[PDB]
């Protein structure tokens, strides 16, 4: 899993 | 009503969308000033500000407004919305493939999963308004993460992030854990990292428990972990800035075209490398007496230096400029700014056809520039570009580049304009060649909604 | 027999191709010396050698090797021959579409127009060898075009090439005009550039009538232009080398790395720029006064110049080092290094394959096949041995061509590229075991990159 | 109420989908019955029916609607919004660049400029309720445009168009003069038209003035074109639909497999060519009397005849059928359907999550959302079932959505799909165990593709 | 001198190059007769020929030339030289990675391996001439492989392959097995099989021994495998041609074009599908009885056989066409051919100029084709463009396609010039519309390589 | 100009 | 490995 | 038309 996203993944 | 509608309130009465910008942030941190903030902290030390009001962010973002939006917008998992598990050391993502509808949202938060909503100003009204204030004052995009943990859990590992964090709690209680970079390399960290474990964390700096309307700030690279327990939940909104907006990037981007022009306006540039360096030169030679190879690794240091002289620094801050125009929110406007600009205008539709058209500016019409972050004069290849993010979308990317181009008999009122806000300037004292310019410009930025007017026009 | 075809027989009795290297450069300037040219002259000023020698490149290239080319091989216009003509202050070219048949060529030529055909070396043999030779004392790739004019003409218009040229007066006589550059940023151009007219010259610094044999240098960014007349053609050949080799080429490589280590090395370069830098910083705040433009300015010179120390060097080098690898011309054996290589072993067919089975000994000696054929770069987390022995005449033809090295092999591998050209017995090798001395040595001698002091024997 | 939203508050009150889409298509152009529609006018003569009634179609759309959506939408230029004019002779075309702003748009309006907003659909929810249920009984995608023309003008030039028309007058009166094909190439034409002049046109087959409630249709290849006269505006909304459903292409989908299925199961297709069948075939060979030229063509003839036989029709059926729910608008759900649908799972939340938890059981009685959401093709060697619940309003904007599904459930998942809409219990799915048809059923249930007859409870 | 110096001899003393190519096939497959071989064998049957003399095919390839290949040329392993071993029922292939080195091959062959290699036409010239001219007459492109097997051994697992072959022994001797095709799919099979077993063969239809100067011709989709043994070599050259010119590869050019044309040509292909053909027409509803499904399959049976009558074959026919001019391999010419052609035009280069200048085609000059499968007229787009093979390289598609346009002013006279080989036609007699026509083709043609004149051209 | 977009396109 | 290569491998 | 051409580009 990720953290967080300043801009929202692909 | 709550401080935050406010203070929201407040911005409407304020002309400068500078000081609107300002305003917004010195709300954001209260009681501390602004001023110690970014001189002391920022990208220094982690800040705790115990607001000690509940009703602090009352009206920004809460579990029934994302309840709402998972049911009436097109949340999609993996996209927007990821569900998150951290047990026994270990990170999870139980992410279902497809809409996050509020069934399945839902059971994975009984199931003890984390929520985690990317970018909830592409939704809500207020969160993109508050976002499209605050990243004026910042210089930088300002984006934001909601997270949504159930009691008693964790569903994150402890990691570090790429950018700097001002975490919002907005409901219920939440144990936080922050650490200082562990070595040099970490701190403002450039990439986010791995997750980590708790083997791999010295003490917190910093270990707390935060309460609605706190603030919880901490630079990039500082690895932090959040917790529920006690049985309640937690529901926060981090919001993010400066990513990848550092000298290195900026020297990224400069470099290329400083040894470009070097080249081009410096003979030293242009001469030949040594016939035979391959001989001393090269990692079989590292461990290496020859001279020749000390005299060709203080020549380059020497270029090196020299290539400061040659950087094209204003035109990489016009190109980040630019990027920056991109990447920005489009902005929310005041009553009166809607009302003096062609948004405002009061031509419609009523009965069977269009009422109170006509509307024309004059010599007379005195102007300024919308806002004070929405434009941006760029010169590319011999052409100017006023580039504009009034047509941007909540959606970050959605759409590409906007710009009108300006000819070099308008470029120097355009250069007035942007500098004279919030200040108005009179259409006949635009510094141009003729009448037909000063109104050419002034209609034309106008129409755009890139201009407002002294006085609502009228027939 | 002519100085070329005494001075190649030379070469193949020199023992280094370093040596043999600097022996044909010696030769092609002579009388001048080397280290006189190379310190005073290279890049600096047009040099002309009257050789006092008509039979001087006797065995190089003539017009009837052209003849025989466009005959016998499928010389394509366009691609490897040009045809141009100059007339009233205009460069023309008349290419028709196609292979280049002797029938079109000569009838241009006899229409007037010059003929300049590209990179012999990739059909002539005399040529490639001739080049491969030099490249490796020039640390550069050495090209080479042919040109040809008719009679009372000139095929180009007055211009400069961005590389060092050396012109070969082959046979006939030609009218050179050298000029040193007009304006600073002409001086060592870093482009060719476009056809000019009489009027964007001034007056020549050198002009002279060249004779079969001279030779004619001038650095590049030296506008030149040459013309036939008395009723007598030209062949020349033009050697060329050094096409971006300049330290910017090579600060354009390392630099997006420094910034790349500093960045990971060094909190100041991670530090965030300022939250109102765009307030000041662009071509509208040009004039602005304001202190914090002059100490941004300050603080991105302190920047740049701390990217030395970041620098590495090292590693470009060897990037440029494998380019250069790619870039070269396949080596030219001479008869002792091919009796000793993998290429020579008497292993033929005569019903069944006849001397066969030969192999390497731990007593085997053994040395690099040459100096400028191979090199070892490390790209990403293993070693890798770039090679030039499989390259075609052909620029670019073959893919870059290499070999992975073990790191029980890299100290070796290192040693073999650095003793040449002193004969090493492969049981003396700083590998670990037995085994990966004669593994390595096996692998690199069955690549045609080493030789030994003994002919192979089973 | 208005007729509009009587047939919508009856739509509701209908259990099939397919019912209601044949409901609404039956109310669209009332009094006229749908099977004489389709069996003697689609595709085959213009129709225009005069409801006798301006509040017909009340609530659909108005000019209002299209004043909030250019104020509160992001509709641009160029590709939301067109502005035409016709003068002279002459189309043209005069969008700005940008942003659609009311103060612009009516500015081009008064300018006697007529405006055209491509797929309101993707603005305005019911507009898109009324494409997305006529969507089910077309078979194809149902599209549409809103015209908007100022009175006294003609906004747009004599064409015809690549789709069957369906014109709705929503407000004002328009002049319209519609013309049958001119040539036999035009009839059901396969690509739009360019604009046309007077002279281009003979006499119309049907001309006549349209008022609020009127419906106009008309098949592709119609040449048709419409002014505003009087001092009055006109808006319309014209829904379209067959856009490329034509047997050709079908076949153009089917031939390539065809003779790649042929080739493989048929020697005769794999038989070499004649090794000199260029000798007579060609161009330039068309009229020899070659009697093995005929022969050569005689054998192509027999060849394709063949190539029906191995026709693979079912899998492009298939193929089609994925593109249609790809193209499909996303379902306008019944209240009934969005209570027994996941969609309406009273699970809220009021510090903490309410009514959680319900599950599915081998009692449920089952069956599909609706019967125009899901389809099951193979590709490949595995199933897959396609839906649009997941798709946008806007056209393509999601990419195909789909869920593979196991050979253990192909059978059940097969019987939901043509058991619509009779209710099925679960524990009743042709599947081998229990867990499989609890898997399937909650699968589905979850995806938002399954209702269950009563309410789910925990 | 050998059989094949003989016919190759006599090649060059006659004037078409079809009666040349005619005539080489004659050779190859004798005694047999071409036309009982083309009616009754071709595709149907295996076919063995027993030469009884060792010399047939001296001068066309050997073991030394192959020696002497590896050294001079640039072999390179994967690309043009293959070892390979077939051990235990398993097939191996042991290439090296790199330059192909007498050492390193010849090495391999000790070790058992066997040695193929392909297109030994891209260096032999004799090869080259021999399947140049064999092109021809097969009106598709003539490949082929060098096989060179060790004593005792097989180097290939049983397998067929995807074109029709012709194995000429060239030295030692072979005990070959070819078995009928298995199935009715590997009738003429179109791609190449996998690696097959004994276990998968049936019984051989034909086992033997071949010797030097023997010719065997199989069919694609006949399996074969080869092995030495009794202490002897073999070394064979299979030429292979009619890959994929099949029917099917024609009328997978036609039907896209036909059902394009059917379409704007006719308006029962441009009529719309049934709205609910989807609800009896897919795989789930195959088991169906409703009689809509009947009648839609009889409607697309129905179409389809009408596509016959739209079929574009001329069009196509002239793709092909263009596509084996592409694909040929460049013409060899006689002496005469060359001595009349612009190849061997006097003018060269001698003492200190060119000699011989000034060679103009006139009004009177008889031409003809230089041969008559080097070029094809093609229509593209409005347009006419003569391909040719002339500027071909004998490495496969190494150039890309050639061709000169023509005007519609000389299509006239460019069709009369291919149909008139090799009959000569006088420039001045050509059908066009002026003189400055006639000498215009005529020109560029003979310029081009692709015309010769009945007498050499003088000044 | 363009006519009736049944797909809106640019 | 491979059988007949009527065009020759890349 | 092109000057010296150090590597043969068309
Ligand atoms: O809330 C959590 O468990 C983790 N939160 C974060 O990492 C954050 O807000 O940046
Ligand atoms: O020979 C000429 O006319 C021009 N020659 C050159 O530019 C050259 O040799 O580099
Ligand atoms: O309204 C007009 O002027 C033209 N309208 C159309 O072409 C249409 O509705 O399809
Ligand atoms: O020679 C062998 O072992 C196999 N030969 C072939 O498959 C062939 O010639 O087509
Ligand atoms: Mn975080
Ligand atoms: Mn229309
Ligand atoms: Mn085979
Ligand atoms: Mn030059």
Same mark, same amino acid.
């Given at each position: 899993?990720?953290?967080?996203?300043?801009?929202?993944?692909? | 009503?709550?401080?935050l509608?406010r203070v929201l309130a407040?911005?409407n009465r304020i002309?400068? !969308?500078?000081?609107?910008?300002?305003?917004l942030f010195?709300?954001?941190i209260?009681p501390?000033?602004? &001023?110690?903030?970014? =001189?002391?902290?920022?990208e220094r030390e982690?800040?705790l500000?115990?607001r000690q009001?509940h009703?602090?962010?009352?009206?920004?973002?809460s579990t029934?407004?994302? &309840?709402?939006?998972?049911?009436?917008?097109?949340?999609q998992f993996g996209? *927007?919305l990821? +569900?998150?598990?951290y047990?026994?050391?270990?990170?999870?993502? @139980?992410?279902p493939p497809?809409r996050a509808l509020? +069934?399945?949202?839902w059971?994975?938060?009984?199931a003890?999963?984390?929520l985690?909503?990317?970018?909830?100003?592409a939704?809500?009204?207020?969160?993109?308004?508050?976002l499209?204030?605050?990243?004026?004052?910042?210089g930088?995009?300002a984006?934001?993460?909601?997270?949504?943990?159930?009691p008693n859990?964790?569903?994150?590992?402890?990691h570090?992030?790429?950018?700097?964090?001002?975490?919002?709690?907005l409901? /219920?209680?939440?144990?936080w854990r922050?650490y200082?970079p562990?070595?040099?390399?970490?701190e403002?960290?450039?990439?986010?990292?791995?997750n980590f474990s708790?083997?791999?964390l010295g003490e917190?700096?910093?270990?707390?428990?935060?309460e609605?309307?706190?603030?919880l700030?901490?630079?990039?690279g500082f690895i *932090?972990?959040a917790?529920?327990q006690?049985?309640?939940?937690?529901?926060?909104?981090?919001? !993010?800035?400066?990513?990848?907006?550092?000298?290195? &990037?900026?020297?990224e981007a400069?470099?290329?075209?400083?040894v470009?022009?070097?080249?081009?306006?410096?003979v030293?540039?242009?001469?030949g490398?040594?016939?035979?360096?391959?001989?001393?030169?090269?990692?079989? *030679?590292?461990?290496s007496?020859?001279?020749?190879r000390?005299?060709?690794?203080?020549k380059? =240091? $020497?270029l090196?230096?020299?290539?400061?002289?040659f950087?094209?620094?204003?035109?990489?801050?016009?190109?980040? +400029?630019?990027?920056?125009?991109?990447?920005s929110?489009?902005?929310?406007?005041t009553?009166?700014?809607?009302? @003096?600009?062609?948004?405002?205008?009061?031509?419609?539709?009523?009965? /069977?056809?269009?009422?109170? $058209?006509?509307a024309?500016?004059?010599?007379?019409?005195e $102007?300024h520039?919308?806002?004070?972050?929405?434009?941006?004069?760029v010169?590319?290849?011999? *052409?100017?570009?006023?580039?504009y993010?009034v047509e941007? !979308?909540?959606?970050?990317?959605?759409?590409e580049?906007?710009?009108?181009?300006?000819?070099?008999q308008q470029?120097?009122?355009?250069?007035?304009?942007?500098?004279?806000?919030?200040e108005?300037?009179?259409?006949?004292?635009?510094p141009?060649? !003729?009448?037909?310019?000063?109104?050419?410009?002034?209609?034309?930025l106008?129409?755009?909604?890139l201009l407002?007017?002294?006085?609502?026009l009228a027939?």
């Open positions: 899993g990720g953290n967080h996203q300043h801009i929202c993944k692909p | 009503m709550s401080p509608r407040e911005l002309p400068s !969308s500078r000081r609107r910008a300002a305003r010195e709300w954001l209260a501390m000033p602004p &001023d110690h903030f970014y =001189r002391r902290l920022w982690a800040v500000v115990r009001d009703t602090y962010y009352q009206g920004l973002f029934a407004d994302l &309840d709402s939006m998972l049911r009436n917008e097109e949340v996209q *927007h990821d +569900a998150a598990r047990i026994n050391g270990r990170r999870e993502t @139980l992410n497809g509020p +069934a399945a949202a059971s994975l938060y009984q003890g999963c984390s985690r909503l990317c970018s909830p100003q939704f809500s009204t207020t969160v993109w308004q508050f499209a204030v605050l990243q004026e004052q910042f930088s995009m984006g934001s993460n909601v997270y949504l943990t159930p859990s964790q569903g994150f590992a402890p570090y992030d790429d950018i700097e964090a001002f975490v919002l709690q409901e /219920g209680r939440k144990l922050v200082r562990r070595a040099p390399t970490e403002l960290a450039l990439t986010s990292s791995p708790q083997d791999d917190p700096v910093l270990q707390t428990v935060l609605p309307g706190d603030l700030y901490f630079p990039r *932090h972990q917790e529920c006690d049985g309640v939940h937690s529901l926060h909104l981090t919001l !993010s800035t400066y990513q990848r907006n550092t000298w290195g &990037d900026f020297l400069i470099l290329p075209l400083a470009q022009a070097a080249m081009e306006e410096n030293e540039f242009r001469r490398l040594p016939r035979d360096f391959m001989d001393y030169m090269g990692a079989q *030679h590292s461990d007496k020859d001279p020749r000390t005299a060709f690794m203080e380059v =240091r $020497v090196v230096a020299r290539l400061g002289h950087a094209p620094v204003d035109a990489v801050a016009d190109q980040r +400029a630019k990027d920056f125009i991109h990447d929110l489009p902005p929310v406007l009553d009166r700014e809607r009302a @003096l600009s062609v948004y405002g205008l009061p031509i419609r539709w009523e009965a /069977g056809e269009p009422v109170n $058209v006509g024309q500016l004059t010599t007379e019409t $102007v520039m919308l806002q004070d972050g929405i434009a941006r004069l010169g590319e290849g011999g *052409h100017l570009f006023l580039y993010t941007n !979308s909540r959606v970050y990317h959605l759409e580049p906007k710009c009108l181009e300006i000819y070099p470029a120097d009122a355009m250069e007035l304009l942007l500098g004279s806000y919030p108005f300037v009179r259409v006949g004292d635009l141009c060649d !003729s009448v037909e310019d000063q109104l050419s410009l002034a209609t034309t106008y129409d755009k909604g407002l007017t002294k006085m609502p027939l």
